Paper text:
The monoclonal antibody [name] binds to V3-peptides corresponding to the stretch of residues 326 to 341 that contains the FHSQ epitope. It has also been previously demonstrated that the specificity of [name] is centered on the stretch of V3-residues 330–333 FHSQ.
The three dimensional structure of the Fab fragment of the [name]-2-neutralizing V3-specific monoclonal antibody [name] was determined to a resolution of 2.7 Å with Rcryst and Rfree factor values of 22.6% and 27.3%, respectively. The binding site of the [name] Fab is formed by the six solvent-exposed CDR loops CDRH1, H2, H3, L1, L2 and L3, which project from the β-strands of the VH and VL domains. However, it should be noted that the conformation of all the residues comprising the six CDR loops is identical when comparing the [name] monomers 1 and 2 in the asymmetric unit. Five of the six CDRs in [name] (H1, H2, L1, L2 and L3) display conformations that correspond to canonical classes 1, 2, 4, 1 and 1, respectively. Qualitative analysis of the electrostatic surface potential indicates that the two sides of the deep antigen-binding cleft are positively and negatively charged, respectively.
Author numbering:
A (entry chain B): 1 to 30, 30A, 30B, 30C, 30D, 30E, 31 to 212
B (entry chain A): 1 to 52, 52A, 53 to 82, 82A, 82B, 82C, 83 to 100, 100A, ...
């Protein structure tokens, strides 16, 4: 197997700056017939992988000239000049010269932007859910930079740890921010047993936590 | 327009068999390699093999020779992959790609992929709960999608009208059931003076739910 080793595995690039990805290889991708079937692909979150570069340097139609590929035999590079926000996703180098055909591991391209506070929103369980006998309390932490964030739940002003599930977004393709959602799930009985429910985010952008709360009545 | 239509999601019990299908349009099917690529939940692409529909000749990656069988149907321009003896670690997204042939030197058109989940759990549709606030000029509304199986679930607001300010979070699995949320932000003068509705699809259960978000009384 021709091992494809990509450096780095993570690429933090500022908006407008050049971004280069290195692909090294176990053997020569120069095929018996003389051609070099080395390709670059792009997989944006939630999409199929798309062809960007073929045969080392040739870019697939519809791919902007901002993308260019170079290198030879064992060593290869892909450069993205003047990076845009919609460029983020995973970049793969790929060899089609020697069976089996092999991909490199991913190069994740993340972008750097200005600091942004999270917009915090708290929601009581809906009437529909209460009727089923469950009671989820959902809190949104939206459009913040950078990645790091934490949530503390309080039932009646006391920290609740058990029963909480969290989910983080991939980087947004428009405004380049991250997002998070937290869900405290209870029984209607457990939920009706208490009164105040608070959601608090700590971010690096503020000293104090953003506190959003509601009372069951 | 070159196109590759892959079958819908699959839930199959451990130690079973699945037949994945891929329908080609917009080019001469019989003169281009069809490739398959595995992608496990998390990261990474892995090449399974190609079939040449013209004469049914193939090449497999050794690792997959015992689990993957490639066939083709010329008459319907369809390519097929059969996956056998199914483990949990076989739960992945499997892609279709047109490869080698006249003026094609890479995998230039990919199918949308087919998500294959291997579990003994039961297909169950989501319950979609509304999320409304308990003038900022900007208001954040949401939908809770809870208790469905398997993946995926697509969420869309007002039949696609609102793309901006839309965040749908990765699902979190607990006790054989997935839960995700999605949020949307709109100017306050457009809610609830106008209708905001989330559209959840669950292809595995063939279920669409459309929930309208109305204020609390």
């Amino acid at each position: 197997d021709v091992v494809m080793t990509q450096t780095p595995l993570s690429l933090p690039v500022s908006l407008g700056d050049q971004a280069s990805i290195s692909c090294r290889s176990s053997q020569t991708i120069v095929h018996s017939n003389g051609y070099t079937y080395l390709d670059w692909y792009l997989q944006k979150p939630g999409q199929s992988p798309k062809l960007l570069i073929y045969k080392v340097s040739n870019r697939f139609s519809g791919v902007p000239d901002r993308f260019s590929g170079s290198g030879s035999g064992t060593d290869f590079t892909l450069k993205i000049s003047r990076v845009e926000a919609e460029d983020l996703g995973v970049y793969y180098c790929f060899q089609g010269s020697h069976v089996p055909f092999t991909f490199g591991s991913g190069t994740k391209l993340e972008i750097k932007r200005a600091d942004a506070a999270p917009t915090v929103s708290i929601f009581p369980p809906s009437s529909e859910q209460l009727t089923s006998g469950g009671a989820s309390v959902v809190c949104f932490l939206n459009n913040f930079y950078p990645k790091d964030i934490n949530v503390k739940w309080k039932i009646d002003g006391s920290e609740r740890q058990n029963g909480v599930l969290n989910s983080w977004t991939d980087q947004d393709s428009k405004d380049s921010t991250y997002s998070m959602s937290s869900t405290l799930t209870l029984t209607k009985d457990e939920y009706e047993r208490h009164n105040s429910y608070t959601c608090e985010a700590t971010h690096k952008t503020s000293t104090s936590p953003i506190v959003k709360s509601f009372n069951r009545n | 327009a070159v196109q590759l239509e892959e079958s819908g999601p699959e839930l199959v019990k451990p130690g079973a068999l699945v037949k994945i299908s891929c329908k080609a349009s917009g080019y001469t099917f019989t003169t281009y390699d069809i490739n398959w690529v595995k992608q496990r939940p998390g990261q990474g692409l892995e090449w399974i093999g190609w079939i040449y529909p013209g004469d049914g000749s193939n090449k497999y990656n050794e690792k997959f020779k015992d689990k993957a069988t490639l066939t083709v149907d010329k008459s319907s321009s369809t390519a097929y992959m059969h996956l056998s003896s199914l483990t949990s670690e076989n739960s992945a997204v499997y892609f279709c790609a047109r490869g080698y042939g006249k003026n094609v030197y890479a995998m230039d058109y990919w199918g949308q992929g087919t998500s294959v989940t291997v579990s003994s759990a039961k297909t169950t549709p989501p319950s979609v709960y509304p999320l409304a606030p308990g003038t900022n000029s900007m208001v954040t509304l949401g939908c809770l999608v809870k208790g469905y199986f398997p993946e995926p679930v697509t969420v869309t607001w007002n039949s696609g009208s609102l793309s901006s300010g839309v965040h749908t979070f990765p699902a979190v699995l607990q006790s054989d059931l997935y839960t995700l949320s999605s949020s949307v932000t709109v100017p306050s003068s457009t809610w609830p003076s106008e209708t905001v509705t989330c559209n959840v699809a669950h292809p595995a259960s063939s279920t669409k739910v459309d929930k309208k978000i109305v204020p609390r009384d």
